[PDB]
Amino acid sequence: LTDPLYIKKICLEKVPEWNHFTEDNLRVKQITNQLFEVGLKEETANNYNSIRTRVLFRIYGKHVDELYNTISEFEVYKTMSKYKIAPQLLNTFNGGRIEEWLYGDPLRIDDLKNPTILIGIANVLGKFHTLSRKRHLPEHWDRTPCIFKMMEKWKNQLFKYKNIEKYCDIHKYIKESDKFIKFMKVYSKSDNLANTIVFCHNDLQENNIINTNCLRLIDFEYSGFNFLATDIANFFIETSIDYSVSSYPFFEIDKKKYISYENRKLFITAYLSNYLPTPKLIDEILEAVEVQALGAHLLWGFWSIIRGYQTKFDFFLYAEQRLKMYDDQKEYLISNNIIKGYD
Numbered sequence: 001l002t003d004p005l006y007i008k009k010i011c012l013e014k015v016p017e018w019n020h021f022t023e024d025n026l027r028v029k030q031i032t033n034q035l036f037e038v039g040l041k042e043e044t045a046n047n048y049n050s051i052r053t054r055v056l057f058r059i060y061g062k063h064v065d066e067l068y069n070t071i072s073e074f075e076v077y078k079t080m081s082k083y084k085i086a087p088q089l090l091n092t093f094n095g096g097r098i099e100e101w102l103y104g105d106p107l108r109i110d111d112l113k114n115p116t117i118l119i120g121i122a123n124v125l126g127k128f129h130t131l132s133r134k135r136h137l138p139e140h141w142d143r144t145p146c147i148f149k150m151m152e153k154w155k156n157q158l159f160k161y162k163n164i165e166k167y168c169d170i171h172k173y174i175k176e177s178d179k180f181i182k183f184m185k186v187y188s189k190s191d192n193l194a195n196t197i198v199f200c201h202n203d204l205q206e207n208n209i210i211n212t213n214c215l216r217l218i219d220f221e222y223s224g225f226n227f228l229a230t231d232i233a234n235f236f237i238e239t240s241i242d243y244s245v246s247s248y249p250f251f252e253i254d255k256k257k258y259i260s261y262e263n264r265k266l267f268i269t270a271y272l273s274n275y276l277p278t279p280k281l282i283d284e285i286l287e288a289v290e291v292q293a294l295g296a297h298l299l300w301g302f303w304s305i306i307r308g309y310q311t312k313f314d315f316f317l318y319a320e321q322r323l324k325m326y327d328d329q330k331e332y333l334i335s336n337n338i339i340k341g342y343d
């Protein structure tokens, strides 16, 4: 399946506009899952201007079922595909799918410091979040907030690993997550707009946002119903994490890079213009986002341990950083009297 002759054979069989070509007409380039650009070679492309000349060929990661329900992932994707939110579905094959090729660049860490970019991301997220009240999403879909489901599932998965202390205070964090979850079942019941349940992406970060000749969202693996502030929290956290480091550990974290308050207000203002602003409301949303960040750290800390056991990026050292970020955020929130009856 990493065999380019086979990737070609599948594309010729599954992409109707390409069924007459042979593998001599096709180019394969490799670009947690496996992605290949598949495309018509230059001279072939030049004779076929009326059709797609590229596809994203996607081979499903071998252990993603430990993270999410595979059947649901696809159902959710087809819907985001039909609504033109996600990359268009071209076809499936045994072990993956073929998608529309997006022409554009993922955003980089430094784009998130640009207020104009921040806005367009806010504009896009705001309009995205109205989907559940403006279109009728399948009624059989689970409305339970994904924060709750992802946390329980990922915490429970950690039990499968026995030598887990060797990667240290994991049982403390596990306990800490039970505290977050208990606190959030109370917290989330107040009237705060930041508690509205909407259909969330659940993994916003610059590399899941593509800049085309407009900003598009991608990678809806984790997408599902969640507290709206959850979606904003991940994005805000991600302003301080750079994944482009090209040597061990392949990441950098800089607290000082965390999106300024000035830029956070700007973002929510732009967000609400598309989602729906009282200054009190902006600050109540910003508070909920800071409360949700607490749970984001535990969640992605657990996710990253699970990934480290799957693979063999230093997932374990990244897990360690996110769990440290939980400690810093907890101490920020408690010592500023923002959360109470947590411990």
Ligand SMILES: C[N+](C)(C)CCO
Residues within 6 Å of the ligand: 203, 205, 300, 303
């Ligand atoms: C955003 N993380 C890198 C923490 C994992 C999701 O792809």
Ligand SMILES: [Ca+2]
Residues within 6 Å of the ligand: 109, 205, 206, 237, 238, 239, 240, 241, 242, 243
């Ligand atoms: Ca980031």
Ligand SMILES: [Mg+2]
Residues within 6 Å of the ligand: 207, 208, 218, 219
């Ligand atoms: Mg992605």
